[PDB]
Design a protein around this ligand. Structure first.
Ligand SMILES: [Zn+2]
Ligand SMILES: [Zn+2]
Lengths: 94, 50, 116, 39
């Protein structure tokens, strides 16, 4: 009765590929802002057909102040035992 | 056993598993390159204290 | 001597004997994991040890400007450039033998003429 | 460069679902492969 929602961890969307990316200070200062991220186009991820090299190219919205091309260095090709979990508040009535 | 433990329930859900770790580094062949170097250089040359 | 570590909890294994087969087993002390030993040696205490003679040799040892240079021949690539240094063990009983590191192949040789 | 690649679009998550929700990183510290889905 205290909570009207299940209190069990939802292991339903865990089968979802996710990339952990470390960003430079200049790029992280504008990509982590909560006054942004309106669903616009932040760039495109480019992967070679044979792999072994990845690069993301930003759009022309940077105002010609930062590089438009970046290289995605895979510090760990096989990342293991790392997961992403959320946190939400429960309904307190009924 | 102990009767009371004082848990703090919260709504949680696993929404992905990490498969790759990436390090974004600007390309040295980009025309706008070396502007970040100037910005990086300015970091050490700035004195906030007055 | 080689140290062994447990598989289930990462704790280090300890020797144990099995009289049923007269063999050497390495068993964990917390989670009951066992594994037969590949060697019968379990302890070693080298009173006189030569470990650390060339400690500190890296891929860029030749970049150190304080190291002295020499014209001795490298008996692996026939090169004359090399950086030499004395033993790095600080016990006051080591000989003054010099260890030569080649700047062309990263090969380490010594000037010892007594035992080598 | 030639079209020897398959590039997909990247766009930010809308803020309408990022409010009142915190996304964290979970790291199991073990030498095995821990997977809560099956293990
Ligand atoms: Zn163990
Ligand atoms: Zn040599």
């Amino acid at each position: 009765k205290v909570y009207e929602e299940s209190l069990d961890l939802d292991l339903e969307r865990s089968n979802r590929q996710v990339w952990l990316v470390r960003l430079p200070m200049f790029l992280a200062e504008k990509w982590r802002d909560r006054n942004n991220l309106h669903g616009q186009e932040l760039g495109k991820i480019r992967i070679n057909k044979d792999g072994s090299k990845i690069t993301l190219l930003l759009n022309e919205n940077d105002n010609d102040s930062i590089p438009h091309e970046y290289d995605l260095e895979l510090t760990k090709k096989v990342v293991e035992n790392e997961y992403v979990f959320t946190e939400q508040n429960l309904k307190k009535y009924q | 056993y102990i009767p009371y433990v004082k848990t703090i329930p919260k709504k949680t859900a696993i929404v992905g598993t990490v498969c790759h770790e990436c390090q974004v580094m600007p390309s040295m062949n980009d025309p706008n390159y070396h502007k970040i170097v100037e910005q990086r250089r300015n970091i050490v040359k700035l004195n906030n204290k007055e | 001597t080689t140290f062994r570590f447990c598989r289930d909890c990462n704790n280090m294994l300890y020797p144990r004997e099995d009289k049923e087969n007269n063999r050497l087993l390495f068993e964990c002390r917390t989670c009951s994991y066992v594994e037969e030993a590949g060697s019968p040696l379990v302890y070693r205490h080298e009173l006189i040890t030569n470990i650390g003679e060339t400690a500190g040799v890296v891929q860029d040892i030749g970049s150190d400007p304080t190291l002295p240079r020499s014209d001795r021949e490298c008996p692996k690539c026939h090169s004359r450039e090399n950086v030499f240094f004395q033993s790095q063990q600080r016990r006051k009983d080591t000989s003054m033998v010099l260890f030569f590191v080649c700047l062309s192949c990263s090969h380490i040789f010594t000037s010892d003429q007594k035992n080598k | 460069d030639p079209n020897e690649y398959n590039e997909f679009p990247l766009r930010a998550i809308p803020k309408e679902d990022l409010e009142n929700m915190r996304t964290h990183l979970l790291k199991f510290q073990s030498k095995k492969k821990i997977n809560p889905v099956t293990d």
